[PDB]
Ligand binder design. Structure first.
Ligand SMILES: CN(C)C1CCN(c2ccc3[nH]c(C(=O)c4ccnc(-c5cncc6ccccc56)c4)nc3n2)CC1
Length: 258
């Protein structure tokens, strides 16, 4: 094959490797090796590539079980936070990274792709500080799961803005905001902070009823340095109700990004 594995990046639900692209100057690429639904998902990927959005990982090739060649990025958001000098991330650097993050999200929503598992472990940061979304559009941590996914009720795009707020926060905290040991625990951790939602905000026909939990806390506690504009925006990303939750397109126009 034209490529040559030099290491593994990680494994999960598939397998991703770091390699050399021998035909293109020995640059680093990323190889993943994984039925119409599959053909379908790849058709979308190939399609999304055409637009070449700066805030999503480039697709270089699809080898004919199935190998997908993407670009390689030196690090993810997680190692960027581990290795970040004290006492954190420059307010301005957060404001910028979030924007780039929201850009690719709107780009993905606008084409009706839902990431479904957006966590800092697949948010890639390049040499220049360019955010690039990885690990999407193909078939451990619930800390970034949205309430409705936890309740197993709605699976639409509002899911990924819940994750955005969770990441937004962590960019201040440098530690995950809600660390739960399981789906019920997780759901608890969330409601301890945002407060019990209105009774009509609980989706119907879900095994978990509103009565199985027990008041809202102020946000500046768990997240310090956050401005009013950060606060307000962050609150509309973590609205319990997916219909009341903000959207990427709507987020891009928040006063916070002025
Ligand atoms: C200490 N060592 C182990 C550190 C080396 C630097 N580092 C990373 C981490 C993630 C990284 N992704 C990448 C990529 O280039 C890349 C490009 C396109 N798609 C993916 C991708 C595809 N499918 C599923 C995925 C699931 C999660 C994340 C990415 C996925 C990855 N390079 C990374 N380098 C941290 C550990």
């Amino acid at each position: 094959q034209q490529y040559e594995c030099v290491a593994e990046i990680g494994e999960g639900a598939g397998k991703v490797f770091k390699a050399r692209d021998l035909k293109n100057g020995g640059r680093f690429v990323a190889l993943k090796r994984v039925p119409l639904s599959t053909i379908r998902e790849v058709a979308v990927l190939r399609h999304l590539e055409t637009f070449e959005h700066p805030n999503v990982v480039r697709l270089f090739d699809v080898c004919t079980k199935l190998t997908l060649v993407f670009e390689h990025v030196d690090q993810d958001l997680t190692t960027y936070l581990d290795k970040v000098p004290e006492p954190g991330v420059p307010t301005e650097t957060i404001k910028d990274m979030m924007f780039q993050l929201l850009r690719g999200l709107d780009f993905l929503h606008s084409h009706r792709v839902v990431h479904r598992d957006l966590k800092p472990q697949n948010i890639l940061v390049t040499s220049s500080g360019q955010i690039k979304l990885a690990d999407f559009g193909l078939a451990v941590t619930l800390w970034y799961r949205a309430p409705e996914v936890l309740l197993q009720s709605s699976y639409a795009t509002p899911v990924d803005l819940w994750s955005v707020g969770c990441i937004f926060a962590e960019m201040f905290r440098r530690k995950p905001l809600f660390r739960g040991s399981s789906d019920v625990d997780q759901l608890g951790k969330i409601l301890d902070v945002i407060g019990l939602p209105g009774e009509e905000d609980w989706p119907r026909d879900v095994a978990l009823p509103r009565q199985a939990f027990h008041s809202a806390q102020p946000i500046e506690k768990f997240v310090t340095d956050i401005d009013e504009l950060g606060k307000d925006l962050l609150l509309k990303c973590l609205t319990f109700n997916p219909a009341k939750r903000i959207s990427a397109y709507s987020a891009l126009s928040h006063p916070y990004f002025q």
